Structure 1
Amino acid sequence: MAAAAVSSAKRSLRGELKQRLRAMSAEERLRQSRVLSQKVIAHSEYQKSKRISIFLSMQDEIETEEIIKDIFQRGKICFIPRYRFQSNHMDMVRIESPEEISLLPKTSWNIPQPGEGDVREEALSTGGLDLIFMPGLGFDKHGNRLGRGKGYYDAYLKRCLQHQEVKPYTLALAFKEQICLQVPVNDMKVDEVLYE
C-alpha cells in the first residue's frame, strides 16, 4: 500500500511535468538548451571525462545536439542508449561521429539507435563510463530524479558498478520547468542537476 502511494505520487507529478513540457515553445526549449550546452562545455567533470554516455533528445528534453558535436571535437569516446523494449533493458553503444546519428534507424519514440543486428561496442565491455548525461521528466535539488516509469536508467547505473572501481559521474540536464520541490522516490540519485 505504501509502495502504491509512492507510485501514485510519481504518476501525478509526471502528469504535471508533462503538461508544462507540452506548454513550452520550440524556440524556448531551444534557448534553455543553448544555455545548458554552454554550461556543460564549461563544466570541469565534462572537460576531464574521456568516455561519455549522452542521450539523443526527445521533444520534451533538453536538446543535446551541440554537446554531441563538442564531444567529438574533444576526441571523447561517445556512447548512446540502445534500448531493448522486449526486456526493458538498455546498453550504451558507441557511435563514431555526429553525422552517423542521421543514418540510424529510429524507435517508436522517433529516437535514433543502432538496429537489432548492428554489432556495437558497448561501454561496459570496453572500460565503463566517466560521465553519464541523465535525462528524466523531473528532478529536485537533492538530485532525486523522476524518470518515465520503467527504471531503465536506474537499472543501468546499478550495472555500472560491476565494471568500474569508480562510479560514473551523473549529470542531469533539465529545463527550469522540470525542477520540483520534492520528487517522490523509492531509486538512484544523480550527482548534479544543471538548469538555467
Structure 2
Amino acid sequence: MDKNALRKQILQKRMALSTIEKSHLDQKINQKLVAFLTPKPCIKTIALYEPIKNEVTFVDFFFEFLKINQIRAVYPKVISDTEIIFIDQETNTFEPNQIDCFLIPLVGFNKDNYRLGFGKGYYDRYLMQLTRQQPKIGIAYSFQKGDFLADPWDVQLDLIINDE
C-alpha cells in the first residue's frame, strides 16, 4: 500500500497513543523481551535504539537484566546520510559482527516480517553486513502491522516481538 502512505498512517496512529496505554504496551513488550533472552544467554553484545517518534520504549528493568548478565548495549549513530554505525556508552564503535543480536525500531511490518523504517534505508544497508546469522528482532506495537510490498533490498526480520 505504498510505503509512504503506510508510514504516515501508522506513524500518526502511534503518535496518538495515550501515556497509560503506551505504558501498558511497553511494559508487556519489555517483559516478552526479557523472557526472550534468558533462554539463550549467549548474547554478550546487543543492538538497541533510542526511542524517538513514540516508538516502543526500553524500560528500566530491561536495562538491569542486561546489567546483571554483563550484556553490552550498543546504539545506532548516523555517520553522514549514507550509513549508520553502532557505539556504546564510552563511545567505542563495534563492528557489525561484534554484535550478537539486533533489537530494531520500526514504523510497520508486513506478513513476511519485512520492515518499514523512516525511508532512509540505513538498516537495510547495514544489516547486509551480518555474516553470523545474528538475530534481527523487530520491536513494535501490534498495530504497526501493515500491508506493503517489499523491495529487493528490504531486509527480512527474523522475529517481531510485540504486545500481541
Q: What TM-score results when the alignment is normalised by the length of structure 1?
A: 0.74
Aligned residue identity for 2:2: A
Deviation, 1:87, is 3.0
Deviation, 1:9, is 0.4
Structure 2 unaligned blocks of 5 or more: none
Larger Rg: 1
Per-residue CA distance 1:60-102 (angstroms, 9 max, x = gap): 2000133333222221122111112x33311010226xxxxxx
Q: What percent identity do the matched residue pairs reach?
A: 22
Match status 1:177 vs 2:143:
yes
Aligned residue identity for 1:58: I
Q: C-alpha root-mean-square deviation of aligned residues, in Å?
A: 2.0
SS in 1 for 2:102: strand
The whole-number CA distance in structure 1 between the counterparts of 2:110 and 2:22 is 19
* Bigger share in helix: 1
Cα 1:57–1:47 change in 2 (3 A) is: farther
Runs of 4+ in 1 over 4 A off after TM superposition: none
Deviation, 1:21, is 0.8
Deviation, 1:11, is 0.4
The whole-number CA distance in structure 1 between the counterparts of 2:89 and 2:40 is 18
Aligned residue identity for 2:68: Q
SS in 2 for 1:183: coil
Give the structure 2 partner of residue 79 of structure 1: 74
Aligned residues: 159
Contact 1:72 1:78 in 2 (8 A): no
SS in 2 for 1:95: coil
SS in 2 for 1:42: helix
Give the structure 1 partner of residue 158 of structure 2: 191
